[PDB]
Amino acid sequence: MVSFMTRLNVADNTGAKQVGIIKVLGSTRKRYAFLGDVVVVSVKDAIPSGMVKKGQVLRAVIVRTKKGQQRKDGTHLKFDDNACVLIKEDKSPRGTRIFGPVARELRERGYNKILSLAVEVV
Amino acid sequence: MEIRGIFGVKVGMSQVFTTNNERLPITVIYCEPNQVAGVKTEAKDKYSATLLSFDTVENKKLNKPQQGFFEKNNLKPTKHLQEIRNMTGFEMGQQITPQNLFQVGEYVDVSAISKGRGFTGAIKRWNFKIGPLGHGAGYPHRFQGSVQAGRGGASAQRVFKGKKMSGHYGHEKVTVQNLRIVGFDEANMLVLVSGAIAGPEGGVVLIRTAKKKPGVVKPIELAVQTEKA
Amino acid sequence: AVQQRRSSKHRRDKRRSHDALTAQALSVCQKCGKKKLFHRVCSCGMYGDLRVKKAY
Amino acid sequence: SYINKPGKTSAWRVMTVRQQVSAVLAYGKIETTLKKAKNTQKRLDKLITLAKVDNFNNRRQVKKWLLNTNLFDVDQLMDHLFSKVAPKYEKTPGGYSRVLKLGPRRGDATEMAILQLTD
Amino acid sequence: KINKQALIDLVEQKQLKAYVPEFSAGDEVNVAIKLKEKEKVRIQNFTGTVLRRRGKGISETFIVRKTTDGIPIEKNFQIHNPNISIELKRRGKVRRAYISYMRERSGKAAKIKER
RNA sequence: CAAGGAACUCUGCAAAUUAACCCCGUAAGUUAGCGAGAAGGGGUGCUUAUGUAAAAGUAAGCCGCAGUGAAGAACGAGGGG
RNA sequence: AGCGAAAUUCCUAGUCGGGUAAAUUCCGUCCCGCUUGAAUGGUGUAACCAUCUCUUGACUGUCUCGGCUAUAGACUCGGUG
RNA sequence: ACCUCGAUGUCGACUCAUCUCAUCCUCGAGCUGAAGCAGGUUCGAAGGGUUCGGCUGUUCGCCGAUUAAAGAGAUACGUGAGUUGGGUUCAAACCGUCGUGAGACAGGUUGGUCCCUAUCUAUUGUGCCCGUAGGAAGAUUGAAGAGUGUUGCUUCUAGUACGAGAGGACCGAAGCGAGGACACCUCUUAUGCUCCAGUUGUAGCGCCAGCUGCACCGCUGGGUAGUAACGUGUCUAUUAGAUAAACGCUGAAAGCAUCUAAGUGUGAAACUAUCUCAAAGAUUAAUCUUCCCAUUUCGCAAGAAAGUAAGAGCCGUCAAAGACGAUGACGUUGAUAGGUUACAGGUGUAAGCAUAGUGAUAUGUUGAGCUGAGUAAUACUAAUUGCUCGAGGACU
């Protein structure tokens, strides 16, 4: 549903506007979008106050899925947009201000710090 | 060892809320309590087997030689009858109910005739790839590629038997195993089981004991609502 | 493609072996004459012992 | 091969069925194809079971499936039907018509079938 | 011999609500969710405007839209789901039982109420 | 035809969005004519009254997710040879 | 004079600075220019182009990634040859 | 310069593949100037696997971003009577050069049409005639077959052992994944043209509505069953026996030593099943269970007039099936199909009436009206008061 070269907005305060998902990590033929997907992205729209330079290949995780998914609970939550957050090889977020609504079932892949510094969890 | 199983009739599939906040697919099978029609023992028949019979109707409409055989065996006249291998723990002239052999939550295997699709394409049968249409590929666009494996009178100059090819799809007994037993209903002659069953409803569907994990069962339970105002 | 080797008369009859045509179904008519066609009306205008049709 | 006549359309089927039901209302015996015969038999039976109470709304509802003939005109045949067929067919549950299979046609070898109605 | 195939309700009887809060597909309802992440009782009242009310038996799913962080999100829920509390906030008038224009119309996202 | 939107690829070829009208607005380059319909944009329904010859026009009310509601009409910019 | 790895450089896929995450064809520049070069015109030039190429806006089943709908055939039956 | 000049299409790219091991990883083992980790070398083993982009007509080539991995070939540098022609490669022209001149350029450039209604064999299904020595109905066994065998992460084991110190084990278990494949329509999406709602103009129903026909199903939004997946659920193993390499034991020959020579072991995604599908046309024509018949008379010593009683076939109805046969089920003793009624589900306050309003409208009647595939009741209609084949056991 979301794969290589997907122009998407940013979900955390890193001074970036439009970023493209350039590769998928993990294993071969992943080619799909899911929760906690650690991928690499390149930014083309940003502001000079941003903490990352334009065109850099940096690792991020998508947090909003316009496709939506069905959970183990039996409930199908779907986003009306798509967004991602940039992180540096760990679970500590890069941006100094976190915003955007996300489900709480993301602890399976870590990211507890983002939830602790989140505006509010879904 | 021993393998236990019986036939039934798929009559529908549904869902249910279970513990740990999970919903499971629930296929429903009508399972009338059947009676063994014959036992093939190691002593005379050299192998373990047991033929059962069911879907009984009034004796008038049934076939004459087989109803005479039934009367010789002193059993009900039934439409369907078939064997199951490796079954001698149950004896001749005994009714069979799901409570006797299978509990709730263990692992079983299911067999059913696939839904008839007739002759089809290779991609719809062997999960192939569509031929491209970009920039006018032409009318010959969806096909099976080629079976060219040799040119020159000393390489193959033929087609090979067993080569992957399209053909009639479905309409065949197919099996999947490790299905979980959800529940039983003796009054309605009904069983609720997990997974999905191939083919359409109304047909005869076999369920045997899983030959992978014979004596393994995991606990699964239900829950009840409490919102009462 | 087109034919590469001609089929002989023996090959012709081997191919035409399946040219035998199956017969039809017939039914007795109690009121009219000749044997009528089964599940079909008779020439005398009558069918399920029932005449509903005008001049044949 | 490639592009040709529109041929068979759902509009064609429904207008042809309307013609056949108008014809059976006018005369009461139609020779056509057996599959078409049963297809129009279903719609005719639906109209007849809709022809029991017969208010003005039902008049228009059944008028959405009728045409005109030479013997009778649309409203005239509607009123004629309402006057005679409804008293005759009201007490029988279903089965308001019967199809009898004829033989092949010398012209076409099609399996002719005659639809008729009598209660 | 003859089977009714109506045993769908027979197996549906395992889950039956005794209060069954009923509403249309164009209203504002607050549905509470009971969650135990590791060890706690969490009651998260998920408010929002219901979108589509589908029903066929034990399987009755309905869609609800909520503006979380100013972002519209659509969630699916099941009517007889356990550990779930439902209470309507406001009941309104809607001319259709299925809405797709609310997927994009954000300006004045509220709905005209029911008299 | 969910989602992405040129990623297959010899190529944004084909295909796709506007396209009609009314009204704002319009860059660079330029032989001063153009460019240019630059682009970008806003509205077109029904009813009640007003307006002239009707109508473009206006005030209000009302509904549909959407009112040249199906119709028939240019998708572009930048740069080089 | 001019133009200079051009439609012009075999060696060579020469740089360099670029757009380009990643550019042998895209651009400006460097000048060892086999066999360029001024009426077989040359260097540019606004507009113009069913001309060629490059990047992008939107656009979508071209693709990711496959599937469905209705006619006509193809299938079966009759006449035809 | 030996076949093909009364034609063997010569680069690839796309799909479709196939095999060998001289194995890239996955497997085991050996050795090491192998403290551990990290490694490096080699052997045996082919059961499975081996990405996406950027450049270029190019394969080959390079680079990037990854994967545990991006192994090699090789089959007309596989694959056009499966696609396409970007490209050199007819006819045009250009730049540059060469040649005085027509003209030459695997130097470069723009453009330049890819012929095909399957005869046999071969192959995916599919049946029909006969057979298996009486006719059948079934159920079987299984000689020979086919499918089918993937990989990674995390946590515990344990910062344990090891190592001073960074580092950090082996084995096992548990959960999480990816891909591969099976089926499914509970949920989620696409479709769902005799379905619904709204909508738009034209022509008429003598008029207003209310309509049909047409305008891509007129347009838009949905949606029943079914049909599919992006959605679900599953499988990703375990074991036994014989083995490669490797490691053995005893042990002499060759009084010691030695895995070997007798004997005596383990042993790998390798090998046989193990799991799945069908399978007696499995002609070596196998097996069992049940029913039927064994009825005037000479023959070519066979049973000929009486032609099953076991049934089969024609026809109808349909589909669970199904291109069409064939198959499954039912034929007045029938719910087999259609009909009608109720119901499910879909759509969403039918139309009319009345109220207030100059009017779009709002309200009660009204969750009503209607609704293709869905459920059961229901013999109301059709499966005929029908026809053809179909009985006596040869020989060793």
Short mmCIF file of N, CA and C (backbone and C1' of nucleotides) in Angstrom, two decimals, chain F residues 4-54:
data_model
loop_
_atom_site.label_atom_id
_atom_site.label_comp_id
_atom_site.label_asym_id
_atom_site.label_seq_id
_atom_site.Cartn_x
_atom_site.Cartn_y
_atom_site.Cartn_z
P G F 4 -2.73 7.80 -2.93
"O5'" G F 4 -1.20 7.55 -3.27
"C5'" G F 4 -0.21 7.55 -2.24
"C4'" G F 4 1.05 6.88 -2.71
"C3'" G F 4 1.66 7.45 -3.99
"O3'" G F 4 2.49 8.57 -3.73
"C1'" G F 4 1.58 5.07 -4.11
P G F 5 2.10 10.02 -4.27
"O5'" G F 5 2.87 10.13 -5.66
"C5'" G F 5 4.11 9.46 -5.86
"C4'" G F 5 4.17 8.79 -7.21
"C3'" G F 5 4.02 9.72 -8.40
"O3'" G F 5 4.74 9.19 -9.51
"C1'" G F 5 2.27 8.16 -8.41
P A F 6 6.31 9.46 -9.70
"O5'" A F 6 6.88 8.05 -10.17
"C5'" A F 6 8.24 7.91 -10.57
"C4'" A F 6 8.36 7.28 -11.93
"C3'" A F 6 9.02 8.16 -12.99
"O3'" A F 6 9.77 7.34 -13.89
"C1'" A F 6 6.86 7.56 -13.71
P A F 7 11.24 6.85 -13.48
"O5'" A F 7 10.97 5.53 -12.63
"C5'" A F 7 11.91 5.08 -11.67
"C4'" A F 7 11.30 4.06 -10.74
"C3'" A F 7 10.60 2.87 -11.39
"O3'" A F 7 11.51 1.87 -11.82
"C1'" A F 7 9.33 3.69 -9.55
P C F 8 12.06 1.85 -13.33
"O5'" C F 8 11.31 0.62 -14.00
"C5'" C F 8 11.53 -0.71 -13.57
"C4'" C F 8 10.75 -1.67 -14.43
"C3'" C F 8 11.02 -1.54 -15.93
"O3'" C F 8 12.13 -2.33 -16.35
"C1'" C F 8 8.69 -1.50 -15.53
P U F 9 13.54 -1.66 -16.71
"O5'" U F 9 13.33 -1.08 -18.18
"C5'" U F 9 12.42 -1.67 -19.09
"C4'" U F 9 11.54 -0.63 -19.74
"C3'" U F 9 12.27 0.38 -20.62
"O3'" U F 9 12.54 -0.11 -21.92
"C1'" U F 9 10.82 1.52 -19.15
P C F 10 13.91 -0.89 -22.21
"O5'" C F 10 14.38 -0.35 -23.63
"C5'" C F 10 15.55 0.45 -23.75
"C4'" C F 10 15.24 1.77 -24.41
"C3'" C F 10 14.38 2.74 -23.60
"O3'" C F 10 15.13 3.47 -22.64
"C1'" C F 10 13.54 2.60 -25.80
P U F 11 14.45 3.93 -21.26
"O5'" U F 11 12.94 4.24 -21.66
"C5'" U F 11 12.24 5.33 -21.08
"C4'" U F 11 12.11 6.48 -22.05
"C3'" U F 11 11.00 7.47 -21.77
"O3'" U F 11 11.34 8.43 -20.79
"C1'" U F 11 10.99 6.88 -24.07
P G F 12 10.63 8.42 -19.35
"O5'" G F 12 9.09 8.71 -19.68
"C5'" G F 12 8.68 9.96 -20.22
"C4'" G F 12 7.21 9.97 -20.55
"C3'" G F 12 6.70 11.28 -21.15
"O3'" G F 12 5.66 11.01 -22.09
"C1'" G F 12 5.57 10.85 -19.12
P C F 13 5.93 11.22 -23.66
"O5'" C F 13 4.76 10.40 -24.37
"C5'" C F 13 4.60 10.47 -25.78
"C4'" C F 13 4.14 9.15 -26.35
"C3'" C F 13 2.66 8.82 -26.16
"O3'" C F 13 1.83 9.47 -27.11
"C1'" C F 13 3.97 6.94 -25.58
P A F 14 0.42 10.09 -26.65
"O5'" A F 14 -0.44 8.83 -26.18
"C5'" A F 14 -0.83 7.82 -27.10
"C4'" A F 14 -1.22 6.55 -26.38
"C3'" A F 14 -2.37 6.68 -25.40
"O3'" A F 14 -3.64 6.60 -26.02
"C1'" A F 14 -0.58 5.56 -24.35
P A F 15 -4.77 7.70 -25.71
"O5'" A F 15 -5.14 7.46 -24.18
"C5'" A F 15 -5.73 6.24 -23.76
"C4'" A F 15 -5.52 6.01 -22.28
"C3'" A F 15 -6.06 7.08 -21.35
"O3'" A F 15 -7.44 6.94 -21.09
"C1'" A F 15 -3.83 6.61 -20.76
P A F 16 -8.39 8.24 -21.00
"O5'" A F 16 -7.97 8.93 -19.63
"C5'" A F 16 -8.14 8.26 -18.39
"C4'" A F 16 -7.42 8.97 -17.27
"C3'" A F 16 -7.86 10.40 -17.00
"O3'" A F 16 -9.04 10.48 -16.22
"C1'" A F 16 -5.50 10.29 -17.06
P U F 17 -10.11 11.65 -16.49
"O5'" U F 17 -9.48 12.93 -15.76
"C5'" U F 17 -9.30 12.95 -14.35
"C4'" U F 17 -8.75 14.28 -13.90
"C3'" U F 17 -9.50 15.51 -14.39
"O3'" U F 17 -10.63 15.82 -13.59
"C1'" U F 17 -7.18 15.80 -14.74
P U F 18 -11.79 16.78 -14.15
"O5'" U F 18 -11.10 18.22 -14.24
"C5'" U F 18 -11.79 19.32 -14.80
"C4'" U F 18 -10.85 20.42 -15.21
"C3'" U F 18 -11.32 21.31 -16.35
"O3'" U F 18 -12.16 22.36 -15.91
"C1'" U F 18 -9.08 20.62 -16.74
P A F 19 -13.44 22.80 -16.77
"O5'" A F 19 -12.88 22.98 -18.25
"C5'" A F 19 -12.05 24.09 -18.60
"C4'" A F 19 -11.39 23.88 -19.94
"C3'" A F 19 -12.33 23.98 -21.13
"O3'" A F 19 -11.62 24.50 -22.26
"C1'" A F 19 -11.41 21.81 -21.05
P A F 20 -12.24 25.70 -23.12
"O5'" A F 20 -13.81 25.61 -22.86
"C5'" A F 20 -14.68 25.06 -23.83
"C4'" A F 20 -16.07 25.63 -23.72
"C3'" A F 20 -16.17 27.03 -23.13
"O3'" A F 20 -15.89 28.05 -24.07
"C1'" A F 20 -17.75 25.63 -22.09
P C F 21 -15.16 29.40 -23.60
"O5'" C F 21 -16.32 30.23 -22.89
"C5'" C F 21 -17.53 30.52 -23.57
"C4'" C F 21 -18.60 31.00 -22.61
"C3'" C F 21 -18.20 32.15 -21.71
"O3'" C F 21 -18.29 33.42 -22.35
"C1'" C F 21 -19.23 30.47 -20.42
P C F 22 -17.20 34.55 -22.04
"O5'" C F 22 -17.66 35.16 -20.64
"C5'" C F 22 -18.95 35.75 -20.50
"C4'" C F 22 -19.26 36.04 -19.05
"C3'" C F 22 -18.19 36.81 -18.28
"O3'" C F 22 -18.24 38.20 -18.51
"C1'" C F 22 -18.89 34.95 -17.01
P C F 23 -16.88 39.06 -18.58
"O5'" C F 23 -16.35 39.06 -17.07
"C5'" C F 23 -17.11 39.67 -16.04
"C4'" C F 23 -16.50 39.42 -14.68
"C3'" C F 23 -15.03 39.78 -14.54
"O3'" C F 23 -14.83 41.16 -14.31
"C1'" C F 23 -15.42 37.63 -13.62
P C F 24 -13.35 41.79 -14.42
"O5'" C F 24 -12.71 41.54 -12.98
"C5'" C F 24 -11.37 41.92 -12.72
"C4'" C F 24 -10.80 41.16 -11.55
"C3'" C F 24 -9.28 41.03 -11.54
"O3'" C F 24 -8.63 42.18 -11.03
"C1'" C F 24 -10.26 38.92 -11.10
P G F 25 -7.48 42.90 -11.88
"O5'" G F 25 -6.30 41.84 -11.92
"C5'" G F 25 -5.72 41.35 -10.72
"C4'" G F 25 -5.00 40.05 -10.95
"C3'" G F 25 -4.04 40.03 -12.12
"O3'" G F 25 -2.77 40.59 -11.81
"C1'" G F 25 -5.42 38.12 -12.22
P U F 26 -2.16 41.75 -12.73
"O5'" U F 26 -1.05 41.00 -13.60
"C5'" U F 26 -0.03 40.24 -12.97
"C4'" U F 26 0.17 38.92 -13.67
"C3'" U F 26 0.72 38.99 -15.08
"O3'" U F 26 2.13 39.14 -15.12
"C1'" U F 26 -1.12 37.52 -15.03
P A F 27 2.79 40.27 -16.05
"O5'" A F 27 4.34 40.19 -15.68
"C5'" A F 27 4.76 40.07 -14.33
"C4'" A F 27 5.61 38.85 -14.12
"C3'" A F 27 6.77 38.68 -15.09
"O3'" A F 27 7.90 39.45 -14.73
"C1'" A F 27 5.60 36.63 -14.90
P A F 28 8.49 40.55 -15.75
"O5'" A F 28 9.74 39.81 -16.42
"C5'" A F 28 10.73 39.20 -15.61
"C4'" A F 28 11.26 37.94 -16.25
"C3'" A F 28 11.88 38.12 -17.63
"O3'" A F 28 13.23 38.55 -17.56
"C1'" A F 28 10.39 36.27 -17.65
P G F 29 13.71 39.83 -18.40
"O5'" G F 29 13.90 39.27 -19.88
"C5'" G F 29 14.73 38.15 -20.14
"C4'" G F 29 14.36 37.50 -21.45
"C3'" G F 29 14.20 38.46 -22.63
"O3'" G F 29 15.44 38.79 -23.24
"C1'" G F 29 12.34 37.02 -22.53
P U F 30 15.75 40.30 -23.66
"O5'" U F 30 14.82 40.56 -24.92
"C5'" U F 30 14.89 39.71 -26.06
"C4'" U F 30 13.64 39.82 -26.89
"C3'" U F 30 13.25 41.23 -27.31
"O3'" U F 30 13.95 41.66 -28.47
"C1'" U F 30 11.36 40.11 -26.43
P U F 31 14.20 43.22 -28.74
"O5'" U F 31 13.14 43.59 -29.87
"C5'" U F 31 13.27 44.78 -30.64
"C4'" U F 31 12.74 44.59 -32.05
"C3'" U F 31 11.30 44.09 -32.15
"O3'" U F 31 10.70 44.66 -33.32
"C1'" U F 31 12.75 42.57 -33.23
P A F 32 9.97 46.09 -33.25
"O5'" A F 32 9.04 45.99 -31.96
"C5'" A F 32 7.73 45.45 -32.05
"C4'" A F 32 6.91 45.75 -30.82
"C3'" A F 32 6.80 47.23 -30.45
"O3'" A F 32 5.52 47.48 -29.87
"C1'" A F 32 7.82 46.04 -28.68
P G F 33 4.39 48.25 -30.71
"O5'" G F 33 3.52 47.08 -31.36
"C5'" G F 33 3.06 45.99 -30.57
"C4'" G F 33 2.81 44.77 -31.42
"C3'" G F 33 2.34 43.53 -30.68
"O3'" G F 33 0.94 43.55 -30.42
"C1'" G F 33 4.06 42.96 -32.21
P C F 34 0.31 42.54 -29.34
"O5'" C F 34 0.33 41.12 -30.07
"C5'" C F 34 0.39 39.92 -29.33
"C4'" C F 34 1.70 39.19 -29.57
"C3'" C F 34 1.94 37.96 -28.72
"O3'" C F 34 1.34 36.80 -29.27
"C1'" C F 34 3.88 39.33 -28.74
P G F 35 0.47 35.81 -28.34
"O5'" G F 35 1.51 35.27 -27.26
"C5'" G F 35 2.62 34.46 -27.64
"C4'" G F 35 3.72 34.53 -26.61
"C3'" G F 35 3.35 34.06 -25.21
"O3'" G F 35 3.47 32.65 -25.06
"C1'" G F 35 4.38 36.18 -25.07
P A F 36 2.65 31.89 -23.91
"O5'" A F 36 1.25 32.65 -23.86
"C5'" A F 36 0.07 32.05 -24.36
"C4'" A F 36 -1.11 32.99 -24.27
"C3'" A F 36 -1.20 34.02 -25.38
"O3'" A F 36 -2.57 34.35 -25.61
"C1'" A F 36 -0.89 35.12 -23.31
P G F 37 -3.43 33.55 -26.71
"O5'" G F 37 -4.84 33.34 -26.00
"C5'" G F 37 -5.47 34.41 -25.30
"C4'" G F 37 -5.77 34.06 -23.86
"C3'" G F 37 -4.56 33.65 -23.02
"O3'" G F 37 -4.75 34.08 -21.68
"C1'" G F 37 -6.12 31.88 -23.06
P A F 38 -4.08 35.45 -21.16
"O5'" A F 38 -2.66 34.99 -20.61
"C5'" A F 38 -2.54 33.94 -19.67
"C4'" A F 38 -1.37 33.04 -19.99
"C3'" A F 38 -1.23 31.79 -19.14
"O3'" A F 38 -2.07 30.74 -19.57
"C1'" A F 38 0.86 32.87 -19.30
P A F 39 -3.32 30.27 -18.67
"O5'" A F 39 -2.65 29.66 -17.36
"C5'" A F 39 -1.63 28.68 -17.45
"C4'" A F 39 -0.64 28.83 -16.32
"C3'" A F 39 -1.19 28.62 -14.92
"O3'" A F 39 -1.27 27.26 -14.55
"C1'" A F 39 0.03 30.63 -14.98
P G F 40 -2.65 26.65 -14.01
"O5'" G F 40 -2.96 27.49 -12.69
"C5'" G F 40 -2.04 27.51 -11.61
"C4'" G F 40 -2.25 28.72 -10.73
"C3'" G F 40 -3.62 28.85 -10.09
"O3'" G F 40 -3.75 28.06 -8.92
"C1'" G F 40 -3.02 30.91 -11.06
P G F 41 -4.66 26.74 -8.92
"O5'" G F 41 -6.05 27.23 -8.31
"C5'" G F 41 -7.03 27.84 -9.13
"C4'" G F 41 -7.43 29.19 -8.61
"C3'" G F 41 -8.92 29.47 -8.55
"O3'" G F 41 -9.54 28.92 -7.40
"C1'" G F 41 -7.84 31.28 -9.59
P G F 42 -10.85 27.99 -7.54
"O5'" G F 42 -12.06 29.00 -7.34
"C5'" G F 42 -12.27 29.66 -6.10
"C4'" G F 42 -13.26 30.78 -6.24
"C3'" G F 42 -14.57 30.43 -6.94
"O3'" G F 42 -15.51 29.82 -6.07
"C1'" G F 42 -13.69 32.41 -7.87
P G F 43 -16.23 28.45 -6.49
"O5'" G F 43 -17.56 28.93 -7.24
"C5'" G F 43 -18.53 29.72 -6.57
"C4'" G F 43 -19.40 30.46 -7.55
"C3'" G F 43 -20.13 29.59 -8.57
"O3'" G F 43 -21.34 29.06 -8.05
"C1'" G F 43 -19.08 31.39 -9.68
P U F 44 -21.96 27.70 -8.65
"O5'" U F 44 -22.71 28.16 -9.98
"C5'" U F 44 -23.73 29.16 -9.94
"C4'" U F 44 -24.22 29.50 -11.33
"C3'" U F 44 -24.99 28.39 -12.03
"O3'" U F 44 -25.98 28.97 -12.89
"C1'" U F 44 -23.05 28.91 -13.27
P G F 45 -27.55 28.80 -12.54
"O5'" G F 45 -27.64 27.38 -11.82
"C5'" G F 45 -27.81 26.19 -12.58
"C4'" G F 45 -28.74 25.23 -11.88
"C3'" G F 45 -30.10 25.80 -11.49
"O3'" G F 45 -31.03 25.79 -12.56
"C1'" G F 45 -29.16 24.67 -9.64
P C F 46 -32.02 27.03 -12.78
"O5'" C F 46 -33.22 26.74 -11.77
"C5'" C F 46 -33.93 25.52 -11.81
"C4'" C F 46 -34.76 25.33 -10.57
"C3'" C F 46 -35.65 26.50 -10.19
"O3'" C F 46 -36.87 26.53 -10.91
"C1'" C F 46 -34.46 25.77 -8.29
P U F 47 -37.57 27.93 -11.27
"O5'" U F 47 -38.08 28.48 -9.87
"C5'" U F 47 -39.05 27.78 -9.12
"C4'" U F 47 -39.29 28.42 -7.77
"C3'" U F 47 -39.57 29.92 -7.80
"O3'" U F 47 -40.92 30.21 -8.11
"C1'" U F 47 -37.96 29.44 -6.13
P U F 48 -41.30 31.59 -8.83
"O5'" U F 48 -41.27 32.66 -7.65
"C5'" U F 48 -42.06 32.47 -6.48
"C4'" U F 48 -41.66 33.43 -5.39
"C3'" U F 48 -41.59 34.89 -5.79
"O3'" U F 48 -42.86 35.51 -5.80
"C1'" U F 48 -39.65 34.31 -4.57
P A F 49 -43.20 36.63 -6.90
"O5'" A F 49 -42.59 37.97 -6.28
"C5'" A F 49 -42.30 39.08 -7.11
"C4'" A F 49 -41.26 39.97 -6.48
"C3'" A F 49 -40.55 40.93 -7.42
"O3'" A F 49 -41.30 42.11 -7.68
"C1'" A F 49 -38.96 39.83 -6.06
P U F 50 -41.19 42.83 -9.11
"O5'" U F 50 -39.76 43.52 -9.08
"C5'" U F 50 -39.41 44.44 -8.05
"C4'" U F 50 -37.93 44.70 -8.02
"C3'" U F 50 -37.33 45.22 -9.32
"O3'" U F 50 -37.51 46.61 -9.48
"C1'" U F 50 -35.97 43.48 -8.44
P G F 51 -38.17 47.20 -10.82
"O5'" G F 51 -37.06 48.20 -11.37
"C5'" G F 51 -36.53 48.05 -12.68
"C4'" G F 51 -35.17 47.41 -12.65
"C3'" G F 51 -34.57 47.07 -14.01
"O3'" G F 51 -33.91 48.18 -14.60
"C1'" G F 51 -34.38 45.20 -12.57
P U F 52 -34.72 49.23 -15.51
"O5'" U F 52 -35.84 48.34 -16.22
"C5'" U F 52 -36.51 48.79 -17.38
"C4'" U F 52 -35.73 48.46 -18.62
"C3'" U F 52 -36.46 47.67 -19.70
"O3'" U F 52 -37.28 48.46 -20.53
"C1'" U F 52 -34.35 46.69 -19.30
P A F 53 -38.62 47.85 -21.19
"O5'" A F 53 -38.11 46.75 -22.22
"C5'" A F 53 -39.02 46.05 -23.06
"C4'" A F 53 -38.46 44.72 -23.52
"C3'" A F 53 -37.65 43.95 -22.49
"O3'" A F 53 -38.48 43.17 -21.64
"C1'" A F 53 -36.43 44.07 -24.52
P A F 54 -38.06 42.90 -20.12
"O5'" A F 54 -37.39 41.45 -20.15
"C5'" A F 54 -38.17 40.30 -20.43
"C4'" A F 54 -37.41 39.30 -21.27
"C3'" A F 54 -36.15 38.71 -20.63
"O3'" A F 54 -36.43 37.66 -19.73
"C1'" A F 54 -35.69 39.38 -22.86
#
